[PDB]
Amino acid sequence: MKTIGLLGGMSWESTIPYYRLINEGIKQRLGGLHSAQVLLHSVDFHEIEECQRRGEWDKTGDILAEAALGLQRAGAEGIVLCTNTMHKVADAIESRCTLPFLHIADATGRAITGAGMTRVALLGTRYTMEQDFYRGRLTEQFSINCLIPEADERAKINQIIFEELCLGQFTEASRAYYAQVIARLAEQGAQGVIFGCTEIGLLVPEERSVLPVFDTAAIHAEDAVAFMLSLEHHH
Amino acid sequence: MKTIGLLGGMSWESTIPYYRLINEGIKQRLGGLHSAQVLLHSVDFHEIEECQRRGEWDKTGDILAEAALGLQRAGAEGIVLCTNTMHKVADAIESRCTLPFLHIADATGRAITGAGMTRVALLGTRYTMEQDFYRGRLTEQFSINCLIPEADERAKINQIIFEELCLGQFTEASRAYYAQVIARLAEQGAQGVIFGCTEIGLLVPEERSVLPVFDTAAIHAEDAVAFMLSL
């Protein structure tokens, strides 16, 4: 199998499901005592966050590109960035490190395309929804029309994420609100909804969503397994 | 902070607590949103198992030594091997990679020294208890005496690990047997008891033991945090 390089620690809590799912996927497909060949670089999130806070995106790009080059020197054969938000600087990593870069939006784009959908909705942090680094990738590379909530909806969605979800508060009022937004975007033509992070899928079970859910973090990990085994698009 | 290099995937399930504990320890010490600077090389464990089956024991050492060299090329500043028993080949790693090798037994030696003890006991797999890779490192580097149970006790301890604990079965019959072994070791003058693996700690809560408990896996992670921060 190919050795995958993970860029993580953003946060470390969300890096663990990548490591778990990649090993579980390898263990299933190959059997026996097989486990995943993984190289992981976990950053100090404080430094990354301080850069974000100050809008120092070029600096985060340098930091992550250098981590990726380091993993390459250790023998990594592909790069997975274990965070939606930091794909803002995916272009920095791709251009400076020659390893294949497995974009989080690309993995979900292939999943959506595989289901025959052409129009979807994206729920995530406000930054992730408003920026073009995720939704622009889907449209440019997959011809997928990607709807986002309106500004008032995006602000409330964002508040719920950072004031409740990230603290472990999963309330029905918030769950209901999310369900309402999904349903409204369904009426606007969305055929599926992308959950931009784990915490949204924890709040909203699929039976509470009128649309099929794309768990973009879980899809990303599955895509990494496929890359390691040279499957499908990676064949 | 210094970047720690982890050799894991033996198993990947047991690597995760190392990662959790080092991140939590760093956050506790530095506050805010600080997390650990960590490089991890997770092996395909099947390759390790097959080296043993093929009788290529030197290759096991070479695989891990090269993994440590790879982490060193990626920026690691010390090496932690996330498994007790694979320290059987720690000499390959420590002698080929010049980064400080934070031997699992060194971490627990510092803990025991910190507690003012000179005589302890070790519970673990029969292999870990009977061979010199763990106990020898302890005594040679720290002048700490490390006793092990008598022969029938080591057999039962080992059987309980592989037949029960590794399959997620934690029975009071087995728990009581361990606690009685610990009491016997205290009678022979052990001042604390080392738990060689997490499974033993899952079976015996430290308060059930008549001796102070050194959880060697958890201490190993705490020691890495101390190294990363120069304390």
UniProtKB/TrEMBL annotation, chain A:
Enzyme class: isomerase
Upper classification of the organism: Bacteria, Pseudomonadati, Pseudomonadota, Gammaproteobacteria, Enterobacterales
Binding-site residues for L-glutamate, renumbered to this chain: 10, 52, 83-85, 198-199
Top-level taxon of origin: Bacteria
Gene name per UniProt: ygeA
Gene3D superfamilies referenced in this protein's UniProt entry, alphabetically: 3.40.50.1860
Keywords linked to the UniProt accession: Isomerase
MF GO annotations: aspartate racemase activity
Presence of keyword Isomerase: yes
Record InterPro entries: Asp/Glu/hydantoin_racemase (IPR015942), Asp/Glu_race (IPR001920), Asp/Glu_racemase_AS_1 (IPR018187), Asp/Glu_racemase_AS_2 (IPR033134), Asp_race (IPR004380)
Organism of origin: Escherichia coli
NCBIfam families on file: asp_race (TIGR00035), PRK10200.1 (NF007569)
Protein name (database record): Racemase
EC number: 5.1.1.10, 5.1.1.13, 5.1.1.-
Family label: Belongs to the aspartate/glutamate racemases family.
